[model samples]
Target: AKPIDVSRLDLRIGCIITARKHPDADSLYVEEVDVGEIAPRTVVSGLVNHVPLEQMQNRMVILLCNLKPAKMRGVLSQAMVMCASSPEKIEILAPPNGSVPGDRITFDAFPGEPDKELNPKKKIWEQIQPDLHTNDECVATYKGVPFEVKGKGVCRAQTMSNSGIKLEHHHHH
Candidate 1:
């Protein structure tokens, strides 16, 4: 079985509760995001150059929840907020109107069990990144199927079309 399949990605809706620039890294922003957990998760993102800290605060976003947490500039990132990136811009994808923190997002037909904290040695996230992107209409998708959050519909970036959807890995500069 392909445990590394796209179906195994743990995508969830999240809301950035607070955000601030990383003290030692000009290109990084440290945020506390609420993904319906007991406490907000500390997420470090390299969106300082592409997205403003003022704009990042309290926004609803999609997150990759199972990626192995890592330290970026000495700050531990517990999860990755997803975004739509082009050579010219990086826009965080918005979860649909009715979507709230902890809502799970899944590809239309790719339902499967997500790994408990993806093993770095497995190359799981690396193998699936290429298939994640936005359709011409700006809807986030995986292999052409829309990312659907049940009862709320789909996810989207403000205006980036046909752009690759990025996890934390792509943000590393």
Candidate 2:
């Protein structure tokens, strides 16, 4: 819907290995998520009311890996969990089964190379957000192509058309 930049993205696969409630926020959880990196990345998510601790623990998710770190409720969050969500439910985007942490996500919709690193000040993610969504069929779609893992379909949001994009769950890249 707006100008497009197919440069680079930092989306990657991450597995939540540890989940703990934030001491200062009733709706925040601090997590240790491994993305096949040298060290686990720390993330702060507001899934406390939507997902139980047991369900949020040890789950594989898509992370907007390159987003600049943000401080939420006094905790610094290094990445965002992509989701198709709404007021009633928030569903995390799931990568394909057996997808290891740190797997770079490629979009079938856009086969061209992405930028190596995005300039956060440019708000590139906002420019493309309108064209992306986890569709009703449980496929993360950008334009018409699904976000894939080695050409295989990754996870979806089980979202209805109106499931809507809810980046407010966290800041996006």
Candidate 3:
């Protein structure tokens, strides 16, 4: 695969402020997430079957900030909340203590301004996804560097570790 520009990728932290099941979908939820901005973002998550709505509120998770907005079942999705999954279970990637929304997520290997936005057609994520995973401590990592906010964990695997860090699409009305 071709190399991706990690330094220019705009991944960040986001906090789930409100989460509720989609009125028209069986396995989707509409959530208001705080990304350290004045206006919270509305996202559609497909965790209804894997996670309970009560556990999603106020949860801190990893996000891909620069992807072009996508619409799921007519609802506009501005960002992607990160998660990890396996045959036995699925876990939303968690952020470390004292971290807040909109905090930048980066690797020690690359430090700089991220791209303002990413080209959806580029598939840059696929080039870098394999290099990201979790550790025994459930902390998220990229090529051995901990995902951090002021030196603390950026996101964790709540139930498992060493799992790949990524996001998936959910279908909702």
Candidate 4:
């Protein structure tokens, strides 16, 4: 088999912080990431147990922007924050060279094709929806992969998650 060319893959790098916690789980923390956008995303990650909340506050990290969103402990995380962890420690795989939120990691292209678009939201949705159970519940998709939506509520008109559902649910019903 040929080695996968990471440079051909469109991976966006971003920074994030531990925004809050999951209402039902003590081992998970809701991360608010600033991907050089107007708003921060709430990613539910289990790193709470490994990485201290205080240490993650206002910290920079890398995320696989193209992966689909997922509902972890009832939280809808938007993207996969890139990390390399040992059995005891989880190290966020950030650009060692230094970068800001929304920075393009690289143009990941195929052996004979152009670079793919690095739409993190789309990529994530395509990777997780195959095993989803609910259809009308509103799930986030990356390249069509369904990610479970989990969160309280977001104010965005297009943000896909429990936040979006809550707002829509209240306005319609």
Candidate 5:
């Protein structure tokens, strides 16, 4: 088995086409996102209290694309919207300008061969997630290496410095 690291994860640029509050959950939002797939993926995010629905639409953001699908309030979530999370605030990680849906995020030396689907039993994401964070400059990183988008620049949080980063969960606070 390959070592657990950022390279084992599949991160990609995503664009939200539509977003609305979840029917049964006040703190959750259901979104239709384009991640360079045959059809848009339905995603559930816990950003209702923090980010407005208007802002979520047409937004270009970072996504964890290889996570095993999970059900949230009867909704099947196929992907995660990555974010920078602090005790006081949580902000979605934005992909660099000029990046479009489907652009794979890269680390400096981690040529990725991400798992087809991350196995939750192995806790691969749980192990690698702790090292994901935003630096003082608001750039998103893993173990201090910036999340880059090839010809573009690094992914980032907006004004959230030195915050832990992760895929947003329904129970997140």
Candidate 6:
């Protein structure tokens, strides 16, 4: 089998954290992921047994933005949340120094013709789901400008920009 060209993956940075417990699975929790869009996604992950609910609540973590929706424990899971763990300890990975949700993760050869053939933007999200649990490094957003966390872990920006803000994630290989 040939190795996958990650540059063509069209992976976008999104932030997610475990939000609540799944109604059916005692070992699973519903994760709420923020893509910097108006809506946050609810995804089911089997990490409740490993990580504490409070530790995951409202914490910044990465999400595979393009995953196809799936049903888990009667709820729709829109995306896959990324994380890492030892045999007994689970740790969620953060994005690079200044990455943020909605930021594009690109490589030098990303817009390459060959990559485009393998990962067309229209279908790229479909390829991200199953690979989520195995792919370790995903994208996330950090505070571009200092901000405060509102009640229940929501973020509140103190400034506004007409031009909007931009953050970049550079990928190589």
The best candidate in terms of TM-score = 5
lDDT of 5 by residue, 1-173 (tens): 68778989999999999899999998899999999988999999988888999999899988899899999999999999999986687899989899999999877576558999998898899899889889999999998999999998999999998889866642435
Q: Using Cα atoms with residue i matched to residue i, what is each candidate's TM-score against the true structure?
A: 0.94, 0.85, 0.88, 0.55, 0.95, 0.56
Please report, as a residue range, the 10-residue window in candidate 2 with the lowest summed lDDT. 1-10
Q: How accurate locally is residue 138 in candidate 6, as Cα lDDT from 0 to 100?
A: 22
Those runs of model 5 whose alpha carbons end farther than 4 Å from true positions after fitting are: 169-173
Error of 4 at 117 (Å): 9.7
| Pairs that collide, model 3 | 94-155, 94-156, 95-154, 134-162
Model 6 segments more than 4 A misplaced? 1-3, 8-10, 85-89, 112-173
Worst 10 residues of 5 by lDDT: 164-173
lDDT, candidate 2, 72-127, per-residue tens: 97889988788877656778877887788988877544556555555678878877
lDDT of 1 by residue, 91-116 (tens): 99998898989999875576588888
Pick by lDDT: which candidate is best?
Answer: 5
Comparing 2 with 6 on TM-score, the higher-scoring candidate is 2
Ranking of candidates on lDDT, top first: 5, 1, 3, 2, 6, 4
lDDT of 2 at 47: 81
Pairwise TM-score winner, candidates 1 and 6? 1
Q: What tens-digit string does per-residue lDDT give for candidate 4 at 1-173? A: 33233433334545665466678998777788888778877776666665687777877665555434567767777766544333333444434334667765432132322134444444432332222121232332222233211222111112122211110012122
- List CA RMSD, all candidates: 1.6, 3.5, 3.3, 15.0, 1.4, 12.0
Model 2 accuracy (lDDT, Cα): 0.75
| Ranking of all candidate structures by their TM-score, best first | 5, 1, 3, 2, 6, 4
| Candidate 3 local lDDT, 39-154, one digit each (tens) | 99888888888889999988888888877788888888888888876656778887778888888887677766765777767767777777777888887787878777767655
Candidate 6, 1-173: lDDT as tens digits: 33344333434456664487787888778877777788887777777765588876766655555445668768887655544333334445544545566665443432332233333345543443223222211222222221112122222212222111111111111
